Amino acid sequence: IVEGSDAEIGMSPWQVMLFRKSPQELLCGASLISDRWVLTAAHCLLYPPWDKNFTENDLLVRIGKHSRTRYERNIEKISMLEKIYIHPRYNWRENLDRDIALMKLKKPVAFSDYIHPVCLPDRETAASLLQAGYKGRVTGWGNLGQPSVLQVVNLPIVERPVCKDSTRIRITDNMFCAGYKPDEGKRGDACEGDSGGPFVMKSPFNNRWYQMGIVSAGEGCKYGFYTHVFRLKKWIQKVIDQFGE
Amino acid sequence: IVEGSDAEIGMSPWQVMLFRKSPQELLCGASLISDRWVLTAAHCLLYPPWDKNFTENDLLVRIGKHSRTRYERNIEKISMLEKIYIHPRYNWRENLDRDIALMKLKKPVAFSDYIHPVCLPDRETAASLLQAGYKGRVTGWGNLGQPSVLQVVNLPIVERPVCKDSTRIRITDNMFCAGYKPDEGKRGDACEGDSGGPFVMKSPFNNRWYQMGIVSAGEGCKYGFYTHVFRLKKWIQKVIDQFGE
Amino acid sequence: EADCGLRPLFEKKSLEDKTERELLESYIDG
Amino acid sequence: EADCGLRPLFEKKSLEDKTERELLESYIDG
Ligand SMILES: *[C@@H]1O[C@H](CO)[C@@H](O)[C@H](O)[C@H]1NC(C)=O
Ligand SMILES: *[C@@H]1O[C@H](CO)[C@@H](O)[C@H](O)[C@H]1NC(C)=O
Ligand SMILES: [Zn+2]
Ligand SMILES: [Zn+2]
């Protein structure tokens, strides 16, 4: 997270540090939605070009953490994954169409002031807060340059016509984009390593935090893309309802 | 369960043997709906006349059992209760109006071919299968006379006008009743000790088993009453959504 | 929750208990 | 699930983080 700033404690408790088994190395990001359901980006797990064939054994996750380096004892939570699930029609080939994934956990996970999940958006919530001129918050650990604690930057959602012209890739509608125009002088964008992490918005209605997207490709280190979670909700609920036992 | 018969294995896997701590004694029945949510009758827990002030510490439950006496090892499951919740407007005084309760479990519980929950009924499901001339299945361990295994009897739902005339108590609409008319010669009714246990119906639509009621007062050892689960669903969902972490 | 009320030894096994038919005998509209 | 997206150190504590206001500055119809 570039030109970010330090989160205070329990400001995104649905944050999850997706942290590969051997060797000992931070991977992407991820997000907690149920007490066994982590939401992340597929190119974390699946992406032929960088040898990426990540299976359920091979990674753990770390839930309810501030610092990247250290270990909080009895504060944070070490979790294995009982199953991964990449999206069926997921297009690594072209434009990361449907860059989205789910990872069931081994055991369930108890909640605390530091661990807690995020709400997934409903109808009103997603065609109300997604907008021209509105911001959400992308939280993440990737480069500066390295941050001893979890970062948190707030970025503004770039108009459909504008992402399109600015980038070379064909954006589908199962993504949106965000990042500051060079116009102002607020620089700020998800760096690479912050992939899979939650774009969040605080509903003015119920005061609830909602994941609208997932860092698909931040770049930072132009506008960062995100998979348009809401426009792939129908998928999530098929996977959760059917497995998840 | 009188004039019953033996269940085969995993025929009601949402059955739960509500089994008091000291001394070692079967209590009512109960039913599994979520992986931390047991559904039972309040007069199991709360009923001034028979000294009944049962608190969360004082009882465990036993999930995924056939035999009453014995112990199936690695088959069944020993569970404590992290919290009870009697219904707020529950009337022990008069006619057991709203005889219904919920018991959160200590830890969560893994599912098996022998443990599994039951579906709670929706709109169609409850004004479609509740009826004049329709039966469900009340499963239970109480007297014969004692049954070395879990019993299972199927009884028919007695018309509104008929329960009323036959009994002395004012039946509310937050109950219905079932048991055979003396007319036929099929005797059969929930005995006392089978309280709190599930009245179930197999939906002809989705082939799904639904709890419509809870043995409120079987008597057996006249028509057995049941709390009209559906007409108190709204309550369940308030309790589950709000606590249950 | 969502896979509920389907006994793993029966409706997932495509089997039927001794007396579940009995129930279905007593429904069906007209 | 149902108590989601309410951080126990903030929205249950009736508090607000440094920059959550910032977000709310950028909405509201007209
Ligand atoms: C990943 O590897 C597995 C077996 O090691 C294989 O079945 C699969 O085809 C590979 N997947 C991709 C997307 O290359
Ligand atoms: C049960 O006992 C507790 C304390 O031992 C008391 O607060 C409560 O009033 C009693 N409840 C009933 C229903 O008698
Ligand atoms: Zn199952
Ligand atoms: Zn909570």
Author numbering:
A (entry chain B), B (entry chain B): 16 to 36, 36A, 37 to 60, 60A, 60B, 60C, 60D, 60E, ...
C (entry chain A), D (entry chain A): 1C, 1B, 1A, 1 to 14, 14A, 14B, 14C, 14D, ...
Provide the publication's sentences verbatim.
Trypsin-like proteases utilize a catalytic triad for activity, composed of the highly conserved residues H57, D102 and S195. Binding of a ligand to the active site requires the 215–217 segment to assume an “open” configuration and is precluded in the “closed” one when side chains and backbone shift to occlude access to the primary specificity pocket. A pre-existing equilibrium between E and E* forms controls activity in the protease and defines a key property of the fold as it transitions from zymogen to mature enzyme. We hypothesize that three critical residues decorating access to the active site control the E*-E equilibrium of thrombin.
